[PDB]
C-alpha cells in the first residue's frame, strides 16, 4: 500500500504522524517501512512499537468499555459492537505479528534487536489473550509465554540487568504472569528480582542511563505496590 513511497519518507512521515497524534497513520507508515525488507535501527524499532502500541491500546480501552457494558447487560447490539471492536483489535495484532514473523525476528541477530522484537511478539499475543475465549485460547497464552521466555533467556545472557529493554521485557512479562497466566506469585517474584538486580547495577551507569533504568524500576515498584 505504501509500496511506492521511499523508505526514508515513510520514516519521516511516521515521526510527523506521532507529533500530530495520528497513530493509525504512524502505524501504516511504519508497516510500509518494515515491508521495504531492510532491518530497522534502534530509533525505527521504537517508532514501530510506539505506533502499534498506541493503536492497539486505544482498541483495548474501547473493548474494555464495551465488555463491561455487555457483562452488566447479561438486543444483540452491545455484543455485536464489542465483537466488531474485538475483530479489529485481533486484525491489528495479527498484522504486527505478521511483520515480526516476516521477517523482522529472523533477521535480528544482535541481542538488542532480537529481544526487542520477541518482547513485542509476547505483547501482541498477550493482547490477543486478553480477548480470547475459544479452542485456541490456551495456545495463544502459550505463544505469548514462549516469546517472552526466549526474550528473557537472551536478555539474561547478553544484557546488563539495568538495560532498559531487559527491564521493560521483565515488566511486561510480569504483567503477563499476573493478568493472563493467573500466576501472581510468579509476577511478584519476577518484578522483585528484576528490581533488585537493577538496583545493584545502577552504580555503573551514566546520568542518562540511570534515568532510563530508574524510570522502569519505578513502574516495577508501582506494580509491586498494587499487587502486594
Amino acid at each position: 500500500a505504501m509500496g511506492s513511497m521511499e523508505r526514508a519518507s515513510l520514516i519521516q512521515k511516521a515521526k510527523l504522524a506521532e507529533q500530530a497524534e495520528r497513530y493509525e497513520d504512524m502505524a501504516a507508515f511504519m508497516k510500509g517501512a518494515v515491508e521495504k525488507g531492510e532491518e530497522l535501527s534502534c530509533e525505527e524499532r521504537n517508532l514501530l512499537s510506539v505506533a502499534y502500541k498506541n493503536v492497539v491500546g486505544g482498541q483495548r480501552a474501547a473493548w474494555r468499555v464495551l465488555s463491561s457494558i455487555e457483562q452488566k447487560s447479561n438486543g444483540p447490539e452491545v455484543r455485536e459492537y464489542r465483537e466488531k471492536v474485538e475483530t479489529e483489535l485481533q486484525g491489528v495484532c495479527d498484522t504486527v505479528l505478521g511483520l515480526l514473523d516476516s521477517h523482522l525476528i529472523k533477521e535480528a541477530g544482535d541481542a538488542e534487536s532480537r529481544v526487542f522484537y520477541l518482547k513485542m511478539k509476547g505483547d501482541y499475543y498477550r493482547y490477543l489473550a486478553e480477548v480470547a475465549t475459544g479452542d485456541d485460547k490456551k495456545r495463544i497464552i502459550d505463544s505469548a509465554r514462549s516469546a517472552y521466555q526466549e526474550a528473557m533467556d537472551i536478555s539474561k545472557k547478553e544484557m546488563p540487568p539495568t538495560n532498559p529493554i531487559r527491564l521493560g521485557l521483565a515488566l511486561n512479562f510480569s504483567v503477563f504472569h499476573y493478568e493472563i497466566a493467573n500466576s501472581p506469585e510468579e509476577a511478584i517474584s519476577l518484578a522483585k528480582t528484576t528490581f533488585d538486580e537493577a538496583m545493584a547495577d545502577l552504580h555503573t551507569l551514566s546520568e542518562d542511563s540511570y534515568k532510563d533504568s530508574t524510570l522502569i524500576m519505578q513502574l516495577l515498584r508501582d506494580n509491586l505496590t498494587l499487587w502486594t
Partner: peptide, 9 residues
C-alpha cells in the same frame, strides 16, 4: 497493572 509505555513520557 501497568506495562511499559511507548515513550519515556
Amino acid at each position: 497493572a501497568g506495562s511499559i509505555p511507548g515513550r519515556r513520557s
